[PDB]
Design an enzyme around this catalytic site. Structure first.
Site, PDB file in Angstrom:
ATOM      1  N   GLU A  48       0.824  -1.197   0.000  1.00 36.23           N
ATOM      2  CA  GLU A  48       0.000   0.000   0.000  1.00 36.23           C
ATOM      3  C   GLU A  48       0.861   1.251   0.000  1.00 36.23           C
ATOM      4  O   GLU A  48       0.483   2.269  -0.586  1.00 36.23           O
ATOM      5  CB  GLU A  48      -0.959  -0.011   1.186  1.00 36.23           C
ATOM      6  N   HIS A  51     -15.979  -9.557  -6.310  1.00 42.95           N
ATOM      7  CA  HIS A  51     -15.585  -8.932  -7.568  1.00 42.95           C
ATOM      8  C   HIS A  51     -16.735  -8.873  -8.572  1.00 42.95           C
ATOM      9  O   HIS A  51     -16.725  -8.029  -9.477  1.00 42.95           O
ATOM     10  CB  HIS A  51     -14.380  -9.675  -8.151  1.00 42.95           C
TER      11      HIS A  51
END
EC number: 3.4.17.23
Lengths: 597, 92
Positions: free
Chosen positions: A357, A487
């Site tokens: 990240e 998803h």
């Protein structure tokens, strides 16, 4: 005067108005997902709708400008961004119906839960509860129960939503000059008028198949190995010639199989490369994890973070009343406010995810040198690959050597090498046929190659064909195993991570190219090598200033997606797999089923 | 805190210490339009200063101290006691 000077004035107005409003929207959504309250989620669609309608407002104020007038590629790719109408172009009932189905899926996927059949108080949602039993329980009946239940409770209830969604969203994609909604997906990778750096929409299908043929042998031997170890871990359940049951895959569907590792370890009496015990025992916290990630960024040649980063992020879980969602994302708020949303435990997965990240935030600060519409990814593949670079190099034993864990007279035999590489290879190999199968299924559905009464039958046929996974209990069309996942019902592009897995090892070899590493890619560390981070920073400072193939040449010197670095990353392990699977069955049969046994 | 703004729209640069003020609506071809018209915008807009801005968008008060050079004699700031001796001088 001409239209392009007043177009520069228009883009000046639009950026210096839009940055502050999108910053307010992203702060509102941030202080909802960090302060979950009614006023905060109503803030999430106050300045959120004030941004979403502003896209169409300045689209119509930009679609006045005709597209075929533009010479500068900068304002060309800007006008292709504003003039994209998006999901606002349908007949007037269908737009709000499409938004209704999106948020309805986004609610009932997240708050839907399964329950114990004989006592309806023992109920568990997806996270936590079900993601722990599929990853840590060693029981056939328990994993199979949670398996059947998560597809029966919400998947049946997400089936008519996706059933109307395919017609609505393919109609919207045909309303925006695309073929189907898979064509709308592949149009993000598609570029126009770059003359040697072009990229068509069918070329993505060609290239994903062109590298999936280059994944099939590695996945064949790795699937044979994990099939043998799942036979040894679950006796009387798995045939040698068949596929895998879909409940024994470490997760619910088959995306990540790394939770097979404690039963698919090659060599269980050599010291495990996972430093989770070394992290908990030697007493570092989450702040040490992120600061060590930042000092890794200084070691690879990149500068430090912003003040909004270490001041206004929520890197950890607060637990009680100020509760926050725990999914590690990197929110790009602008104004120098680029944050990592995460609930970081004392975890090497959280260590690599901290590097990951912060790799996203590093790429954000690298494309921060643009104006805002070039302050994004070039494509939907560079952001996550630049994330996974720092984790993949940070996974290597040379990294854990030079951090302060992994007590420094650590052995580098082929034993723990095959252990670490197969640990990586479970994740990296097993995520590829699941990705190709899921996106190929959804492309077939959005085109209409799969009929409305054959989603679930051809779904399991593709699970057997591509991933090599069977169902232990069958499904009619009442169920919907794609739409009960994060998803499919929440509208996330999923081939972007396939392209990530290719660009990962590409950029990894280009960063180990100038770093002068001695052995292969798997022992390579880009820490203390400024040329690696500078070589990623030359491509990283583009953003959407160029089409993605030019930046792909700016890392490796190529125009197309390739898996040859992943071959160089897995090939000694791949020959080890072939030598261990000379006594295991080579292939899978699409007739086997644990209900048909 | 949106009580500080700026101009990004002007027909050229500034002369020495021409303090542009004007609340006259901008358009790049003369032509004083009427907002929300086409390509006849607002020259003055916000900054977007938050305290939650990090290093990147900090509001800085800038003082510029024009040190002009002896058009008139000494005003800005610049006891020697000597009697019956020949020494060099400067007075006020």
């Amino acid at each position: 005067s001409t239209i392009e000077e007043q177009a520069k004035t228009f883009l000046d107005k639009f950026n210096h108005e839009a940055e502050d409003l999108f910053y307010q929207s992203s702060l509102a959504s941030w202080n909802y997902n960090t302060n979950i309250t009614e006023e905060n989620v109503q803030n999430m669609n106050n300045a959120g709708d004030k941004w979403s309608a502003f896209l169409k407002e300045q689209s119509t104020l930009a679609q006045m400008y005709p597209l075929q007038e533009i010479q500068n590629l900068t304002v060309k790719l800007q006008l292709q961004a504003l003039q994209q109408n998006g999901s606002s172009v349908l007949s007037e009932d269908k737009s709000k119906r499409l938004n209704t189905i999106l948020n309805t899926m986004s609610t009932i996927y997240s708050t839907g839960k399964v329950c114990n059949p004989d006592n309806p108080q023992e109920c568990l949602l997806l996270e936590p509860g079900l993601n722990e039993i599929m990853a840590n329980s060693l029981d056939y009946n328990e994993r199979l129960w949670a398996w059947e239940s998560w597809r029966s409770e919400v998947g049946k209830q997400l089936r008519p939503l996706y059933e109307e969604y395919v017609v609505l969203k393919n109609e919207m994609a045909r309303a925006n000059h695309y073929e189907d909604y898979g064509d709308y997906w592949r149009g993000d990778y598609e570029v126009n008028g770059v003359d040697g750096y072009d990229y068509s929409r069918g070329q993505l299908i060609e290239d994903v198949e062109h590298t999936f043929e280059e994944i099939k042998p590695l996945y064949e031997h790795l699937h044979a190995y994990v099939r043998a170890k799942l036979m040894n871990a679950y006796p009387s359940y798995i045939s040698p010639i068949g596929c895998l049951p879909a409940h024994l895959l470490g997760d619910m569907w088959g995306r990540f199989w790394t939770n097979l590792y404690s039963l698919t370890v090659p060599f269980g009496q050599k010291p495990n490369i996972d430093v989770t015990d070394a992290m908990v025992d030697q007493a570092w916290d989450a702040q040490r994890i992120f600061k060590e990630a930042e000092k890794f960024f200084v070691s690879v040649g990149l500068p430090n973070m912003t003040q909004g980063f270490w001041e206004n992020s929520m890197l950890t879980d607060p637990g009680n009343v100020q509760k926050a969602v725990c999914h590690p994302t990197a929110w790009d708020l602008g104004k120098g406010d680029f944050r990592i949303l995460m609930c970081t435990k004392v975890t090497m997965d959280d260590f690599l995810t901290a590097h990951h990240e912060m790799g996203h935030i590093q790429y954000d600060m690298a494309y921060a040198a643009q104006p805002f519409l070039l302050r994004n990814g070039a494509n939907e593949g560079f952001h996550e690959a630049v994330g996974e670079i720092m984790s993949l190099s940070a996974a290597t034993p040379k990294h854990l050597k030079s951090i302060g864990l992994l007590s420094p007279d650590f052995q580098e035999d082929n034993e723990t090498e095959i252990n670490f590489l197969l640990k990586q290879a479970l994740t990296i190999v097993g995520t590829l046929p699941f990705t190709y199968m899921l996106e190929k299924w959804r492309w077939m559905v959005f085109k209409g190659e799969i009929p409305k009464d054959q989603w679930m039958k051809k779904w399991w046929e593709m699970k057997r064909e591509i991933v090599g996974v069977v169902e232990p209990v069958p499904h009619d069309e009442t169920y919907c195993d794609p739409a009960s996942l994060f998803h499919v019902s929440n509208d996330y592009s999923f081939i972007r991570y396939y392209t990530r897995t290719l660009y990962q090892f590409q950029f990894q070899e280009a960063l180990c190219q100038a770093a002068k590493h001695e052995g292969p890619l798997h022992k390579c560390d880009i820490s203390n090598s400024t040329e690696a981070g500078q070589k990623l920073f030359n491509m990283l400072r583009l953003g959407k200033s160029e089409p993605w193939t030019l930046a792909l040449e700016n890392v490796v010197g190529a125009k197309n997606m390739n898996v040859r670095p992943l071959l160089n990353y897995f090939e000694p392990l791949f020959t080890w797999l072939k030598d261990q699977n000379k006594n295991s069955f080579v292939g899978w049969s699409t007739d086997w089923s644990p209900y048909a046994d | 805190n949106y009580n500080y703004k700026y101009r990004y729209l002007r027909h050229g640069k500034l002369r020495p210490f021409e303090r542009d003020i004007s609340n006259v609506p901008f358009s790049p071809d003369g032509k004083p339009c009427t907002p929300p018209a086409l390509n006849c915008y607002w020259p003055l807009n916000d900054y977007g200063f938050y305290t939650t801005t990090g290093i990147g968008y900090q509001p800085y008060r800038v003082v510029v101290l024009s040190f002009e050079l002896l058009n008139a004699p000494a005003t800005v700031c610049g006891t020697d006691l000597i009697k019956n001796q020949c020494v060099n001088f400067n007075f006020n």
